[PDB]
Every structure is written in C-alpha cells, then in structure tokens.
C-alpha cells in the first residue's frame, strides 16, 4: 500500500520498531530501497512524535467481530495516541483476516513466548525472582479505528458485523 503510491506521490514515512522482535527495521529498509524517505524509531517515542503526524496505516493479524483487532504488541498505544490527537488510523487487511468472534475469551488472547527476547538468560540469579512476560499480540478496540481498507473497498468498523454475516454461517462460529 505504501510503495504503490510512491511512484506518483512523495511523503515521509515513520516506522516504529517492535521491542520483542524488531521487525520494523526490515520494513524500513525495504521502503528506503524504493526512495520513500523512511525513518526508524522506538515505541517509547510514539506519543512524543505523534504531534506532527497526519495519517496512520497499519496491518493486523485478525479482525474480531465487533470491529476490534488482534495486532502486534504496541498497536493499542498507537491507537490511543491517534485517538488523543484525532488522527485517522487505517487498517489494511484482506478478507481472510476476519474471524467470527467477539472479545469473549480471557488471557489466551495474546501469544506468550520465551522471555529470552525481553530479558536475556545471562542476567544472573535475579531471573529466579523477577517475573518476565513477553506478549506478542495485543487487543485494539474498535472505537479507536477509523477505516478498514480491504479488497472490496474501504468500510467503517461499524459494518464489520455485516461482513461477518456475509462471510461465515452462525452455526460454524464455534467450529
């Protein structure tokens, strides 16, 4: 979505890396390879830099039933900052990323991986006392989202329920 418009428009892209798995560096490099004037930064400076930002475009892992998302860790704070500054937050996700479930569940929402990425094993004896948690994903409510760009055109989160009714059958929700 970003590199398709760089051939006819010129803009500035800010990329916030992910603390557990710094995957934003690859995206920043791939974008700079096309001449888009990209920048890389940490999550701690999200709100500090989100006063000069004009738009936000992100990707999700799955779309829930009430229009909320299961995105990588750090997207909830991004949506909060967007809502504080009243900036539109666009979500580019195909139709196969749409799940027919509401935030029913509890605790098993996020995928927890080994704490090696957050705190290394070479710390010392403090690892027996310190409790480390490494959630990969997080929950983003629908109220902080503005638009959903899909293969069938953009739509509002308040219409995602209809897409659910259009995609899946109510008896196959539990599977």
């Amino acid at each position: 979505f970003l590199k398709e418009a760089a051939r006819k428009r010129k803009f500035h892209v800010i990329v916030a890396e992910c603390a557990p798995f710094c995957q934003g560096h690859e995206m920043a490099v791939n974008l700079s390879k096309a001449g888009i004037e990209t920048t890389v930064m940490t999550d701690a400076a999200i709100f500090a830099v989100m006063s000069r930002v004009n738009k936000v475009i992100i990707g999700t892992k799955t779309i829930l039933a009430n229009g909320a998302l299961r995105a990588v860790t750090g997207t909830h704070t991004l949506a909060l900052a967007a809502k504080h500054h009243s900036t539109p937050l666009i979500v580019c996700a195909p139709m196969f990323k749409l799940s027919p479930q509401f935030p029913n569940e509890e605790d098993s929402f996020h995928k927890f991986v080994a704490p090696e990425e957050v705190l290394p094993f070479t710390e010392g004896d403090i690892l027996e006392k310190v409790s480390v948690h490494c959630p990969v994903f997080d929950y983003v409510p629908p109220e902080l989202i503005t638009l959903f760009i899909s293969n069938i055109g953009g739509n509002a989160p308040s219409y995602i329920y209809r897409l659910m009714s259009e995609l899946y059958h109510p008896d196959d929700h539990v599977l």
Binding site: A65, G67, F102, N104, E106, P142, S158, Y159, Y161, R162
Partner: protein, 285 residues
C-alpha cells in the same frame, strides 16, 4: 372484557414472565376468537386490543410486541392477500413464533455468560430476569464473582434483585442510587437489562441507567446490555425529552445513547449498537 382478564391471568400464573410475551400470547389467543372474515376488521379489532392492552400496562415492551405482531400479520397478508387460508397459516406461524420467543432468555444467557471472568465485579442497576439468568448461568459454569446492585429508589426492586442473587450463594451488595459513582471504580463490567431498543441502538431503561452509563463511559468501563428481540421499537429519541410521555409515566424511564453501550446480547446473537438498526431496517416495521 376478556382482553384485560386474559392479560392479567397470563401475567399471574408465572410472575417471572415479562409483559410483552404475555401480551403476544393474549393477542394470539384472542386471534382464535375472531369471527370476521375481512382483513381490516381483523386488523382493527386486534389493533384496538393492542392499544387497550398498552393503556393498561405503560411499558415499552408491550408496545414493541404489539408492533411486531401487526408487522407479522402484514407479512402474512402479503402472503397471498387471501384471509381464507391466511388466518390458519398465520396461527401456525404465530405458535412457532411464540415457542421461539420462549427460548430467547436461555439463548441470551448462554451467549452472555461467557463475558464474565472469575473474580470480576459486576454492576447492575435494577432487578431483571435476563441479568439474573445470566448470573445464574455464570455461577453454574463454576465461576465466582461479586455483584453490586442499585437499590432503585423509585420502587425497591434492587433489594429484590439482591435477595434473589444472594439466594444463589453469590456475594451480592446493595448500594445507594446516589453511590453509582463511588463504586464505579470497583466494577470490572456493567450488565443491565433493556426495556426497549430504539432505532439507533440506545436503550430505554429505568430512570437510573443513563447516569450509570455516563459514569461507565467516564471510566472506560464495559457497559453491556441484555435484551430480547421482541423489545425492538422504532423510536429515535434525540434527548431525554423526545421519549414518549406515555412510556415515562417522577419519570419511570430514560433513554441511553448507543455511544455509551459496548455490546448487546440478544437472542439473535451478540451484536453491536449499530447492528440493531440493520435488523430493524430488514424487518421494515
């Protein structure tokens, strides 16, 4: 007459049962009495009965059930424009509709009881059979939680709700009507029943519900609502004054905007504040 008496009889064998379901049962039972074979005579006689019933019981649910019955008869009229086999097919469809509406409460409980977690605090305003069923199914699911009920000063029904909840071995607690803001921070979610669902998504509930929703919005507290499908009404109040005065009568009801509601648990499924408008548009009531 017989309409008043039959309504009160159905209300009295089981107190539990709501007024709108009893009204629909009375309307269908009086449908067997109909002798006229013209469609406007059936329409006017039944519409007269629904208005009289609504006069007897000033509630939004009765009017909603009456509007739904007339819309269902209008669909069964667009069947063939017959009123020769139409009355028969209509009676069968109505019986099916009544049996289907009977299971609404169980469906709502089985679908809403999953949003309650162990160790969480719930905040309810007034007594409601739907929230009671949800809580009974949650405690039936090997869950433990605490509940806070508002005393509901207009009529002391919150104490009845607390008694019925404490009877189920749950640590219930009654708070003052003016203390809804003091205990809002000690609540994880809010679940209340709705007397009637408006066109946009808001709810018409007891006088002490909109202020609680406002406090929930002020503290990012999930405000859930549980209501059946026969409570959908084609109203669109813009404020507390646009609500019809016949439903309020110290008013006895208020309107809550959909922006303060998180989700809706109905027999048709778990819905958002906007999906009800789609449903109402599909019915063309």
């Amino acid at each position: 007459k017989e309409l008043i008496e039959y309504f009160k009889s159905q209300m009295k064998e089981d107190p539990d049962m709501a007024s709108a379901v009893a009204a629909i049962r009375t309307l269908l039972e009086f449908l067997k009495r109909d002798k006229g074979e013209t469609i406007q005579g059936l329409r006017a006689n039944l519409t007269s009965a629904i208005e009289t019933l609504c006069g007897v019981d000033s509630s939004v649910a009765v009017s909603s059930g009456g509007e739904l019955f007339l819309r269902f008869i209008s669909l069964a009229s667009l069947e063939y424009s017959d009123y020769s086999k139409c009355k028969k097919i209509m009676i069968e469809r109505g019986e099916l509709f009544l049996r289907r509406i009977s299971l609404s409460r169980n469906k709502i409980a089985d679908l809403c009881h999953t949003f309650i977690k162990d160790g969480a605090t719930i905040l309810t305003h007034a007594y409601s059979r739907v929230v009671l069923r949800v809580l009974e199914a949650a405690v039936a699911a090997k869950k433990r939680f605490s509940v806070y009920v508002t005393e509901s000063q207009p009529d002391l029904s919150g104490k009845k709700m607390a008694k019925a909840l404490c009877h189920l071995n749950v640590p219930v607690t009654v708070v003052l009507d003016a203390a809804v803001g003091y205990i809002m921070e000690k609540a994880d979610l809010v679940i209340v029943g709705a007397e009637g669902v408006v066109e946009n998504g808001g709810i018409i509930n007891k006088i002490g519900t909109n202020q609680m929703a406002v406090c929930a919005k002020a503290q990012n507290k999930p405000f859930y609502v549980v209501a059946e499908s026969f409570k959908f009404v084609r109203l669109f109040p813009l404020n507390q004054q646009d609500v019809p005065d016949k439903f309020k009568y110290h008013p006895w009801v208020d309107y809550t905007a959909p922006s303060l509601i998180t989700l809706l648990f109905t027999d048709l499924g778990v819905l958002t504040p906007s999906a009800v408008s789609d449903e109402l548009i599909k019915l063309y009531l």
